[PDB]
Design a protein around this nucleic acid. Structure first.
Lengths: 195, 139, 52, 145, 133, 47, 103, 97, 120, 28, 67, 175, 100
RNA sequence: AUUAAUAAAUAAAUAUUUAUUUUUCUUUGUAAAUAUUAUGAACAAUUUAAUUAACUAAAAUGUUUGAAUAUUUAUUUUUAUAUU
């Protein structure tokens, strides 16, 4: 909010939804760095704010694949768009990442002494992706339902995201009711490896 | 089990060393401190009674002791004791003739042994300008 | 750690993981001494078979 | 099922070692909870110190069934504080007297009353009974600094 | 003659209840927070509970009570190691007092943050709620 | 000695605080990008 | 949230007969518009648990009021109280308190 | 040889490094280099002071004095000898310049 | 602990009212123990002589003056108000019941031999 | 190394700990 | 156990005298009032127990001759 | 290099044949024996001895129906500080005492309560002076000390706590 | 009385008893340095430290070698057995500065 | 540790001798003079991120059920204490 920060940033209206940390939801007015702001503006994904745009804005409808969906930028629409973008952001952060875990495996071995739990998965998700979730949402596979992960190398589980039906993310993702958390367990230094 | 789950207040009990040990008058609104500062401050054992003197039991620090040879201070104070060439000793700065070997990578080693890890010592025992110009013929 | 009457030979490699911690399917000790000296054989884990 | 049996075979440590590792994890979690606890707490002068504990669940689970090493401490915390009001606290604090302090001390109470340091000096201390049961401080010269 | 003390003042908690009354018993289970595993206390844990610092010769009466005394009641001398142990106990007391004084001084100056933990712990542990405002 | 001790403390803090770094694809640390907190699908009960 | 004033006045008068108001405001604003019978806390303290012992023991029988200038701050304080186990929480403002006469 | 040390407990027997709380050799080099760089930057925070003739190192002082000897014996302001060994130009304005 | 041919008093951990008195016969050093420390690598040898200093003490008298509170039940932690020397404070019964068919049965005398009363 | 004395430390024997016999007035 | 990396070192067998295993209980063991030991023999009732003010227990038992 | 030449030639008489006859062989054998005995004492002798003591205590416990495991745990619970050597000695030479200890462990006798924490008397909070006499807290502490003095043993000072507390009046002289 | 404590309020801190349970020298030098800052160098050593942000940071760093116990100022005062009106600040001011 | 060769703060390691009380909750081996210094890795992968111990004792470490048996689908049995 400082003058220097505003100088190095620039306000921009997002014509469509971009899930990147510098992105936003359709109709969102946000201060974005000059580089990516110019990138979006030239690609057509954002435009400089104006009174007419703030009162009402045109956006992109995938049904016709054109920036021909006029919508008023009222408070209720802004709230709904913020919620929908938050849901999509959580989904994208989970799907486009690789949850690192540092655990102890005495000797060479093939699995870890202390199996991972839903609490551990939630804590690692918060640490890396800065996402808070109820551990009950995380569900392990059939192989890992009884004793947790308990294996080195590439592992993954399911993260359930309720509210997708209400928000309308039916066709915007692969499966709106599930998210595949992809994990990678490894032996790390003493300081990084607890338990 | 070597994984014991007990409170560390139990791990360090304060039952027999309450605050009264160092603040004896604390219970009477008098904050006087009598705390044994350090183990260094130990004047030694003292008999509680004259009828039960402590035994004179020899320790290795006070028994393994040699007879006193007059030093420079004693001979300066009372010249009557400078009775021999033996008493005529050199300056105290003279430790004596050197013993051991000043090995390069290990310091001073006893003459006993442990020569295997010392070769630079023997190398030294067995005993840039080209890039700079000459300002004048004579230098 | 003992005689065969208390510790079978295949149990020697019990510190390692894998099939070696399972009792071998075939034992060739009581009958005769095979020329190759293989004394135990495990169930085929695919086209691979383990012998001791 | 097949992969489950494979994982069962691929165990690095014995069961007892695994139990010890689980206990280590539990200790780590307990330390995490302790550090998670707040820095301070807002306490009332009148209420017993034991009011509002973060360990109430464990106390109910264990202490009420059987005595703990800190039974006396728990009883003291349960009992109400003996300093009811700030006025009482200030009165007691004023009554409190410091002897080893560096600065001067009031003497308006009684002229004839003399301090031990004044009577005998700083370099002299009583001949304390030096015994196993009662060990006095040694070398006040060392004690000074 | 003989001595048996568990506290510095020599006071002890009532060991024998009134006749016909159900006596109190200690908590045999370990002090682990989780209900499971349900493990009984180890001998070392019992030593800690009863006051000895895990070992018979570390703390408690076996360390604080003189091992001998003259028949006429005259006590024993102050050994160097006895003085060192007394200094160690005074050092533990000094550590506790100095830590408490530091906490009080920080509170008075206003340095004790209202937030539960540090930045590292807060961003590592989800259990700490968000205090943004 | 003060400078060396301060540098050692700073190095220890830097090497021991940031245990894990957010994935570069999600947000590039070298580009100053940072990820905010998404508490949408969260819970308030002390689980 | 906001409620009528006469009902709050009568409830505070003939229901509590004590102190049940927790004030979460900046010191300057608290001094500008003080309330003598309301205890001044900080929402961070409420959420962290530093106020647990002072808060009433009987969770069910204790209904609390929160005095704040920001609706978000009041909601955060109410959430902290509910997390600590106080679901009977209401929000009031200085104008409502003055109109009731609690000031 | 290895420096043997008098033990005070079996923990000292198990110990490998005499000072576990001390960084390894490479970390020591890194920390020393960082500390030296920080000290150098702190020293150079102010500009490069143009020290007088008498303050120059022993191998420049006498050369400068001999170069300016004549001006010293015949006093008139505005006489400066453009010697070569003098301090190099910093390149930016400084408080002492 | 204190005890005799007919009683035994334990301390938890210690006891009171026990007068154990002895006479310090000698203050000497016991047999020397020689610790020879050497390593095949370095030509250094250390010869430590540990004569364990000891005091030889001959016990002259042992007396006990206990203060008993009252009779204490074993199978229950309660302590009795009334002491009855003519009745066992904790009676004992045989093990055999017939339900355990594969039970190692000892000789009948040992299996059920009643015990006398040690206070009459 | 450096010692913190966080654990019990046995005081080192030193010549200043000699049991000094107190001066006694003569018997005559 | 030990992984592939660890080098095998056949240790000397512990030729010590191991204490024999005891019967185990799941309820009595976890009960706080009831101790682990379960001793009740022919001469058990003759070991009368009395309390002591200090805290100890005074046992009255028959003599070696009587046993 | 120093070797225990003179020290070991003395005991060289304790060997046989070549070692006892030839100085070098005897000295080498004695040096090796001393080093091996030192190593055994410092790394295995204690283990062997304490295992033997454990087995003796376990056999006594088995004869009495118990075992080493339960006996050790119950000794810890009851706060009976008998080292394993002491337990073996008692079992071998005082079977009745060992049986009494086992009976104590078996019985549901409440183990001793944990040590008490120092308690601040109300006299400390009592104001002094209220607005020649003694502080009430100091008087209480003196009474406790006199009680300990009297209870430590059958001293001839008398059992009158008040009389002992008023001792200084005996030496005081009326003006 | 189902109401907030009606009286003046005093802030009370905490004190951490930190006990070393694993060989500190077997970890990286950063862990050993944090333990030494906590005044720990060998297994089985226990120390008493204030509840402050720096100590919390150190304990968080070395939480897998350290077992922690908490003691409010009230609990510590009761443990040491001193009058409630006396202050640990007063005790600290009284005790000597050249102790160890 | 490692820069041959024009105006660039500083090689390090080991050893010897020697030097500096700078404030912050705790903790912390920094510097100088001098002597010596070939005990020697090829690829791939990834990455502006991953042999020591004073004595005595104590002492906590550690062969069926996504099948099997059977007949022309039904059956079967799927915590502790303690030891370096």
């Amino acid at each position: 909010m400082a003058p220097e920060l505003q100088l190095e940033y620039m306000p921009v209206l997002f014509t469509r939804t971009i899930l990147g940390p510098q992105g936003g939801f359709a109709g969102e007015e946000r201060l974005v760095k000059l580089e990516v702001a110019r990138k979006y503006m030239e690609a057509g994904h954002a435009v400089t704010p104006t009174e007419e745009l703030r009162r009402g804005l045109w956006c992109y409808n995938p049904d016709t694949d054109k920036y021909d969906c006029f919508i008023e930028r009222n408070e209720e629409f802004l709230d709904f768009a913020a919620r929908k973008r938050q849901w999509l952001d959580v989904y994208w952060r989970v799907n486009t990442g690789y949850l690192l875990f540092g655990r102890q495996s005495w000797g060479q071995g093939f699995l870890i002494n202390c199996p991972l739990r839903k609490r551990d998965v939630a804590q690692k998700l918060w640490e890396q992706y800065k996402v808070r979730i109820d551990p009950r949402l995380i569900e392990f596979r059939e192989k890992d339902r009884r004793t947790g992960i308990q294996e080195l190398g590439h592992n993954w589980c399911w993260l359930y995201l309720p509210g997708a039906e209400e928000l309308g993310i039916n066709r915007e993702v692969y499966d709106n009711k599930r998210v595949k958390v992809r994990i990678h367990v490894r032996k790390m230094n003493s300081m990084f490896a607890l338990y | 089990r070597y994984r014991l789950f007990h409170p560390r207040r139990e791990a360090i009990p304060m039952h027999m060393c309450p605050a009264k040990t160092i603040f004896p008058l604390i219970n009477s609104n008098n904050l006087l401190v009598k705390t044994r500062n350090s183990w260094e401050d130990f004047t030694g054992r003292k008999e509680f009674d004259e009828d039960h003197p402590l035994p004179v039991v020899g320790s290795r620090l006070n028994g393994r002791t040699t007879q006193h040879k007059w030093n420079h201070w004693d001979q300066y104070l009372n010249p009557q004791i400078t009775q021999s060439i033996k008493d005529l000793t050199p300056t105290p700065e003279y430790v004596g003739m050197r013993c051991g070997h000043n090995m390069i990578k290990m310091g001073w080693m006893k003459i006993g042994g442990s020569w295997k890890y010392s070769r630079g010592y023997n190398d030294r025992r067995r005993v840039r300008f080209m890039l700079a110009p000459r300002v004048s013929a004579g230098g | 750690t003992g005689s065969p009457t208390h510790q079978r030979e295949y149990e020697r490699f019990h510190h390692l993981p894998g099939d070696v911690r399972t009792r071998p399917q075939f034992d060739f000790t009581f009958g005769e001494t095979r020329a190759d000296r293989v004394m135990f054989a495990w169930r085929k884990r695919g086209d691979l078979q383990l012998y001791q | 099922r097949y992969r489950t049996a494979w994982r069962e075979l691929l165990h690095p440590l014995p069961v007892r070692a695994r139990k010890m590792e689980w206990l280590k994890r539990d200790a780590v979690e307990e330390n995490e909870e302790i550090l998670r606890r707040p820095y301070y707490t807002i306490k009332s002068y009148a209420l017993p110190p034991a009011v509002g504990r973060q360990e109430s669940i464990h106390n109910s689970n264990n202490i009420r069934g059987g005595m703990h090493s800190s039974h006396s401490l728990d009883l003291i915390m349960r009992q109400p504080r003996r300093v009811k009001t700030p006025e009482q606290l200030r009165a007691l604090r004023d009554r409190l007297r410091f002897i080893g302090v560096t600065g001067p001390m009031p003497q308006a109470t009684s002229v004839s009353t003399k301090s031990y340091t004044d009577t005998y000096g700083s370099r002299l201390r009583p001949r304390y009974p030096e015994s196993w049961d009662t060990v006095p401080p040694h070398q006040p010269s060392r004690e000074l600094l | 003659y003989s001595e048996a003390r568990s506290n510095y003042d020599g006071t002890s908690l009532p060991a024998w209840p009134a006749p016909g009354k159900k006596p109190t018993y200690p908590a045999a289970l370990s002090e682990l927070r989780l209900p499971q595993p349900r493990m009984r206390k180890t001998r070392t844990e019992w030593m800690y509970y009863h006051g000895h610092g895990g070992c018979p010769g570390k703390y408690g009466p076996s360390r604080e009570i003189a091992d001998f005394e003259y028949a006429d009641g005259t006590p024993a001398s102050i050994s160097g190691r006895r003085f060192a142990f007394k200094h160690h106990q005074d050092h533990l007391l000094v550590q506790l007092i100095r830590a408490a004084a530091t906490v009080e001084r920080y509170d008075a100056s206003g340095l004790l943050p209202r937030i539960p933990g540090t930045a590292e712990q807060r961003n590592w542990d989800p259990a700490i709620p968000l205090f943004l405002d | 000695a003060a400078a060396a001790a301060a540098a050692a403390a700073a190095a220890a803090a830097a090497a021991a605080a940031a245990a894990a770094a957010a994935a570069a694809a999600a947000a590039a640390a070298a580009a100053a990008a940072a990820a905010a907190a998404a508490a949408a699908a969260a819970a308030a009960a002390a689980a | 949230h906001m409620v009528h004033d006469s009902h709050k006045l009568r409830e505070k008068l003939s229901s509590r007969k004590g102190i049940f108001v927790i004030d979460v405001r900046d010191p300057g604003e608290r001094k500008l518009n003080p309330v003598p019978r309301s205890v001044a806390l900080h929402h961070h303290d409420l959420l962290s648990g530093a106020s647990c012992p002072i808060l009433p023991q009987q969770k069910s029988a204790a209904e609390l009021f929160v005095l704040a200038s920001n609706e978000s701050r009041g909601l955060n304080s109410a959430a902290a109280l509910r997390r600590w186990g106080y679901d009977s929480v209401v929000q009031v403002d200085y104008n409502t308190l003055v109109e009731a006469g609690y000031v | 040889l290895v420096k043997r040390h008098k033990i005070t407990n079996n923990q000292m027997l198990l110990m490998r490094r005499r000072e576990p709380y001390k960084p390894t050799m490479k970390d020591r080099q890194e920390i020393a280099d960082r500390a030296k760089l920080e000290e150098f930057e702190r020293k150079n925070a102010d500009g490069l002071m143009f020290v007088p003739e008498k303050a120059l190192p022993p191998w420049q002082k006498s050369l400068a004095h001999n170069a300016k000897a004549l001006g010293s014996r015949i006093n008139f302001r505005g006489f400066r000898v453009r010697v070569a060994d003098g301090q190099d130009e910093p390149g930016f304005p400084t408080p002492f310049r | 602990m204190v005890g005799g041919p007919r009683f035994t008093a334990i301390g938890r951990p210690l006891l009171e009212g026990v007068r154990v008195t002895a006479q310090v016969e000698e203050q000497k050093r016991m047999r020397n123990v020689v610790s020879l420390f050497a390593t095949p690598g370095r030509r250094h040898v250390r010869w430590v002589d540990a004569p364990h200093a000891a005091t030889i003490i001959r016990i002259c008298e042992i007396f006990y003056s206990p203060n008993v509170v009252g009779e204490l039940d074993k199978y229950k932690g309660e302590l009795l108000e009334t002491f009855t020397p003519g009745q066992h404070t904790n009676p004992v019964y045989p093990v055999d019941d017939g339900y355990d068919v594969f039970r190692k049965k000892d000789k009948e005398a040992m299996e059920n031999a009643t015990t006398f009363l040690d206070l009459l | 190394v450096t010692r913190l004395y966080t654990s019990y430390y046995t005081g080192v024997l030193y010549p200043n700990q000699l049991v000094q016999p107190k001066q006694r007035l003569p018997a005559d | 156990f030990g992984g592939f990396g660890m080098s095998v070192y056949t240790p000397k067998k512990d030729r010590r005298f191991r204490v024999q295993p005891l019967p185990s209980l799941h309820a009595n063991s976890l009960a706080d009032d009831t101790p682990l030991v379960t001793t009740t023999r022919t001469l058990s009732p003759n070991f009368r127990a009395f309390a002591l003010q200090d805290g100890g227990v005074f046992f009255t038992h028959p003599s070696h001759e009587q046993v | 290099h120093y070797r225990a030449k003179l020290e070991l030639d003395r005991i060289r008489s304790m060997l046989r044949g070549r070692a006892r006859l030839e100085r070098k062989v005897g000295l080498k054998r004695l040096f090796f024996l001393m080093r091996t005995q030192t190593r055994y004492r410092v790394e295995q002798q204690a283990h062997w001895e304490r295992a033997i003591v454990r087995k003796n205590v376990d056999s006594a416990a088995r004869e009495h129906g118990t075992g080493w495991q339960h006996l050790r745990n119950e000794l810890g619970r009851q706060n009976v500080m008998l080292l394993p050597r002491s337990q073996q000695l008692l079992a071998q030479y005082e079977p009745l005492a060992f049986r009494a200890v086992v009976e104590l462990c078996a019985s549901r006798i409440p183990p001793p309560p944990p040590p008490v924490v120092a308690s601040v008397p109300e006299e400390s909070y009592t104001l002094w002076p209220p607005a020649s006499l003694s502080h009430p807290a100091a008087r209480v502490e003196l009474r406790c000390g006199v009680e300990r003095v009297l209870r430590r043993g059958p001293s001839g000072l008398g059992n009158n706590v008040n009389e002992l507390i008023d001792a200084w009046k005996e030496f005081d002289v009326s003006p | 009385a189902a109401a907030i404590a009606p009286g003046p309020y005093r802030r009370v801190g905490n004190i951490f008893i930190v006990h070393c349970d694993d060989h500190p020298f077997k970890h990286s030098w950063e862990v050993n340095r944090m333990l030494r800052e906590l005044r720990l160098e060998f297994k089985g050593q226990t120390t008493i430290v204030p509840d402050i942000p720096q100590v919390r940071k150190r304990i968080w760093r070395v939480r897998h070698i350290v077992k922690v116990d908490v003691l409010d100022l009230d609990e510590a005062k009761a443990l040491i057995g001193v009058p409630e009106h006396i202050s640990f600040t007063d005790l600290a001011s009284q005790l000597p500065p050249s102790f160890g």
